Amino acid sequence: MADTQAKSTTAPKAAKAQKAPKAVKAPKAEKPAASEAKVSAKKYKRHGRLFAKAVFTGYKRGLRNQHENQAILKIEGARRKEHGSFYVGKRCVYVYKAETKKCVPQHPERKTRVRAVWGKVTRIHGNTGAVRARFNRNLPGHAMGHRIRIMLYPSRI
Amino acid sequence: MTIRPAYRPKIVKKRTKHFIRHQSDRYAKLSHKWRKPKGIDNRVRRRFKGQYLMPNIGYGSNKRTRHMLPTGFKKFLVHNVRELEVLLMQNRVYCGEIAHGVSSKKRKEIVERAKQLSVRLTNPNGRLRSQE
Amino acid sequence: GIDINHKYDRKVRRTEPKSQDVYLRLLVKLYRFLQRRTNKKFNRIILKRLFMSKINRPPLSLQ
Amino acid sequence: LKSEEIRKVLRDPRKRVFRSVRRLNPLTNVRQLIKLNPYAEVLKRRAALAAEKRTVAKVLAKAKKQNVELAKSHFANVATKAAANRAKLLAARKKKVA
Amino acid sequence: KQISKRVAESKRRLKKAAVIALRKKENLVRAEKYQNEYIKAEQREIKLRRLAKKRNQFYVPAEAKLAFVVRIRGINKVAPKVRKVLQLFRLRQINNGVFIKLNKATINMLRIAEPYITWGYPNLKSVRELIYKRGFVKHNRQRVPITDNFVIERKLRQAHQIQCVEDLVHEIFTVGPNFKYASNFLWPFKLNTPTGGWRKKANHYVNGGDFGNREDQINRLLRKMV
Amino acid sequence: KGKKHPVNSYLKGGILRYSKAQMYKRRALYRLKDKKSPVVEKAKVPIKKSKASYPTKTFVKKRPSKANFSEHKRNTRRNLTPGTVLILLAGRHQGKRVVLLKVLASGLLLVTGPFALNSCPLRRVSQRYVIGTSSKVDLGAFKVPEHLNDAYFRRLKAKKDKKTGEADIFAAKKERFVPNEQRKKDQKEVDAALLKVIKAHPEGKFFAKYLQNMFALHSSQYPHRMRF
Amino acid sequence: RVKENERLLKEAKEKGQWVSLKRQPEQPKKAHFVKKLEEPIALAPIPYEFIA
RNA sequence: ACCUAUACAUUACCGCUAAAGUAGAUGAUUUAUAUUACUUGUGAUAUAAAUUUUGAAACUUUAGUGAGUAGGAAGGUACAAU
RNA sequence: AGAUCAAGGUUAUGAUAUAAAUGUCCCAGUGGGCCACUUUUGGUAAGCAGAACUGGCGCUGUGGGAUGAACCAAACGUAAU
RNA sequence: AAGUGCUGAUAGAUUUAUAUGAUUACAGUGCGUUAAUUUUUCGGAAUUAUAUAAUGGCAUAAUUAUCAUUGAUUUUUGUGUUUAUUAUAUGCACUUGUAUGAUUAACAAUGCGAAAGAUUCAGGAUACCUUCGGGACCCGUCUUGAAACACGGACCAAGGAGU
């Protein structure tokens, strides 16, 4: 009985398509004879354009340690662990303001008022979507409630 | 300016910040430098949770970047021009530091000769300051 | 970690004498050459007998 | 050490060091498998073609449903039995020697 | 003279090389016989069972030799005479393992550590993957892992008869009379830690579940733990 | 000759070549050309090909290690085909909705604006920068002008001044864009070619009057679980 | 244990193989098939005894 | 389904314990070439070139391994005068 | 019982050996201890005393019951995962 | 149980191998029999016999041995047989080329060690100050036990106890 479920959901590889490995539809269609393809709805909220917003929530805190070489994030789009795994491997970048310039504009133009350390998210951590993240240096400690970002780089389909 | 020495890598050290001697905060009869506090109660001797990271053989550097100053060499004491003839052919390896009992008479004789011997000093311009 | 770095992990016996000679070292700096090309047991017992103190490198009378 | 009385008895100039101390994985290096273990090539090159004919065995259902091609992507992949018939006509004409 | 040195090397340059080509045949002739030793046996239990169903008999499976023993609990808070038994199987650290040759005479050595060891009977795919993945070997009492077929052959060739990694399989997974020297030859492994976890680590298997006479569900562990 | 049998590219353990060369050899009569050139030979009559001692000497210098000098690896990319309009995230030209043209053997992928409509050139971008989109903009029967290439559009060159070397340099010199006049014509060859195919399609989100504004999206629409 | 080994090797001195002369306890045995043969199953002793 | 330890595993690194290798450099060693003995083809010669140093108390290499007061030995540095 | 010939299998239970084997300095210390489970006297008894067999605390940090020398995980070279 | 077949990632990459000793050997490439079958027709494509111990399939001979024994497990094999199978029957030079010496590296960008002068990129609690997150009793010592509601310590320079 489950043998067509080894078959029918290769129609996504037949509707994308690639080598077309299924003839039965699984279309999510409006037809009365088309009541399948089984979405794990619902959620309807973007948080994905560029610098898709996600505020920050302290380090990968033990109860009585820190391990501040890493950091942990709060990703406002996501709310189940199937959501957040689309944020694997993105960079993580956070700007924060300061006084002087001290650097010329040579690699593409900078009058230099903004200052920003950098980094890279890795893996999904919390069973609702909190996804820990490592930086270039270390997340400067007073940011627990600053509006850090995640840009789309790099991405796929 | 000077060619950097002889297979210059990333000098990357384990623990860098200095090591400051349990309870040297509230006694200024207590100096800066460390003494493993050998007495039976202590709060750091037991390698506890919070205190001034306790030294051992771990923290050292690699056994090729031993002694390696931030410009590739290993530092070396120099006195007069004859010991700069020791740095004749090794010039691409080590450097020199002009010993601070040398006056500005004799330090005129290092900085004009060993420049052409292509060695590096840490300190020229000691008393130069182009006066006597 | 485990527990055994127990005792003795420590091979006691002597590697080189507490003696700063330049003649006795010249035998050592020769007879280290002639026990690490051949494997002959007779050379090693020469080498391990180049190491005891004044006593126990025994006196030995002619009869 | 000149000597002509010592270096007729010396034995070993092991000039090469023979260190080569690196380990390797038995799945991520498929290259490793045959080296430490031949017959690992056998079990792959047995079951791989069995999967490979089975890749033909399910596109022919699509070539049963729609019957489109079979032009140059799998037409020559199924016309090889006509060449492989000749691999068994020798079983009918060249294997008749014993 | 080094002119006469040239014949000693270049012949040996062919002699050490050409025997590898023979060893390539030697490491192939065993394994091609080694494979279907499993396969006849894998069909042998279907044939004995189903015939006994046709002949209306209860066919028992064979009770097994070849256990495999992985430590669970520390170095400390250990019982009195379980300190010498556990140095007498070379389990010392947590998550290290060796094998045994089972009889009664190791059960009542295994029972007097049975709260602290979790011993099981492996399948095919564990033992192939064990010496492969986290297997090291022990020549001249050191620990230099695998990297070729050489690290068995160099020191098991004359007095014992083993020279390929699937032949060291043969004198353990099939159990034989050279076995006792065929796993002091291994250093204890270093198994990692099995993700998903350990389910409780409290008790013996058959009330709460962990250490002990588990003997068949050891394979769902070693797919993770190693 | 023949029967190369390289099935070393889908298994990936298949070799299948030793199974041929048993009877495939002729088993006797070895005849081959056997080039035995002694040409690297110091015939220093007036020649002096030792080589001549410009140095032959011990100028002491130590240089970085003999690296692998690796091969331009095959290019694993997600399955998408030109033409597909895509959202540029980069190049100081973010937000433009631009279309694939041609993949290149450097692991690169040709995109144009076009400069006629989008006011964007024939920019080559990374696949990791750019988010792929859903459906097809049909560009099957195109002229595929592959004569424009990667090495055709490298920086040319590091001369440090005026193709002469040791000369005088000035602040803010220009050597990397006029931009080139042929690329304007190379734009003109495809912009006239792309307008007829892009306006004949049934109109959509980024097709005719539709691509030219700057990605920005209302709620209840996904980066997450869209069949995107 | 001595004089058997002097005699069971002595009978082994006419065929050669094999000595088998050390000591081994009981082993994991075999894999039978077992007919009932004797009285098919159930045979169901299930306790109920507390109340007394 | 997740959660955290200086525990477990793997890559580097430190010191320590164990094991192992290296000294005819008025040589060794390739790279070419002239030749040759020619043994098909392997070797010796000659030319040209370049690599070849350390308190053998050195040097290379290999594995394992590291808590600690009471206490014992191990090399390391201050402040002295002869 | 001893010496000395004659015959003799593969040496005779498992599993190891992080190496085994010993003579000095009688080598510095230390000769007051504490606790839980079972086993247990004295007492009605106690965070008391009094013990045999282990493990631990003193010598020991540690992750966990907020806390706490012993409880339960684990016994502490510097580092990332 | 079999690479069944990927698709997506994480951080990490020893190596002055003479600064006192294969840079070699496995494999992959282009050159010198063959015959047609087949397909594309632009290549490719597909063909055996050439030799084996053959190793299974089957058949019978034969035996060691077996819970059992109609038997079946086998053992030693011995032979026949077709059917599968694999490795051996690749020298000669060449190649940025596979793998091998703790197997990480082609590309690209960013920049002139600019007479003196001096911008750029990372790092840098050197010992502060500034801004936040966890940690955290304040030091000797007798004792089973000291953060002690146990004793000694106001601060500092010089002197002091294994001769």
From Swiss-Prot, chain B:
Coiled-coil ranges (or none): none
InterPro entries linked to this entry: Ribosomal_eL32 (IPR001515), Ribosomal_eL32_CS (IPR018263), Ribosomal_eL32_sf (IPR036351)
Protein name: Large ribosomal subunit protein eL32
Lineage of the organism: Eukaryota, Metazoa, Ecdysozoa, Arthropoda, Hexapoda
Source superkingdom: Eukaryota
Keyword entries, A-Z: Ribonucleoprotein, Ribosomal protein
Organism of provenance: Drosophila melanogaster
GO function term, MF aspect, one: structural constituent of ribosome
GO CC annotations, alphabetized: cytoplasm; cytosolic large ribosomal subunit; cytosolic ribosome; nucleolus
Gene Ontology terms describing biological process: cytoplasmic translation
GN (gene name): RpL32
Family to which this protein belongs: Belongs to the eukaryotic ribosomal protein eL32 family.
From Swiss-Prot, chain C:
Superkingdom assignment: Eukaryota
Compartments where located: Cytoplasm
Signal peptide: none
Family: Belongs to the eukaryotic ribosomal protein eL18 family.
Protein name in UniProt: Large ribosomal subunit protein eL18
Gene, per the UniProt record: RpL18
Swiss-Prot record, chain D:
UniProt keyword Ribonucleoprotein, yes or no: yes
Keywords associated with the record: Ribonucleoprotein, Ribosomal protein
GO molecular function per UniProt: RNA binding; structural constituent of ribosome
Organism superkingdom: Eukaryota
GO CC, alphabetical: cytosolic large ribosomal subunit; cytosolic ribosome
GO biological process: cytoplasmic translation
UniProt similarity note: Belongs to the universal ribosomal protein uL4 family.
Name of the featured protein: Large ribosomal subunit protein uL4
Residues of the full protein shown: 296 to 393 of 401
From Swiss-Prot, chain E:
Keywords: Ribonucleoprotein, Ribosomal protein, RNA-binding
Gene3D superfamilies found in the cross-reference section: 1.10.15.30, Ribosomal protein L30, ferredoxin-like fold domain (3.30.1390.20)
One of the record's GO molecular function terms: RNA binding
InterPro entries given in the database record: Ribo_uL30_ferredoxin-like_sf, Ribosomal_uL30, Ribosomal_uL30_CS, Ribosomal_uL30_euk, Ribosomal_uL30_euk_arc, Ribosomal_uL30_ferredoxin-like, Ribosomal_uL30_N_euk
CDD domains: Ribosomal_L7_archeal_euk
GO CC, alphabetical: cytosolic large ribosomal subunit; cytosolic ribosome
Transmembrane segments: none
Keyword field contains Ribosomal protein: yes
GO terms (BP aspect): cytoplasmic translation; maturation of LSU-rRNA from tricistronic rRNA transcript (SSU-rRNA, 5.8S rRNA, LSU-rRNA); pupariation
Domain of life according to the entry: Eukaryota
Keyword Ribosomal protein: yes
Protein role: Binds to G-rich structures in 28S rRNA and in mRNAs. Plays a regulatory role in the translation apparatus; inhibits cell-free translation of mRNAs.
PANTHER family noted in UniProt: 60S RIBOSOMAL PROTEIN L7 (PTHR11524), LARGE RIBOSOMAL SUBUNIT PROTEIN UL30 (PTHR11524:SF16)
Assigned protein family: Belongs to the universal ribosomal protein uL30 family.
Name this polypeptide is given: Large ribosomal subunit protein uL30
Organism annotation: Drosophila melanogaster
Protein's gene: RpL7
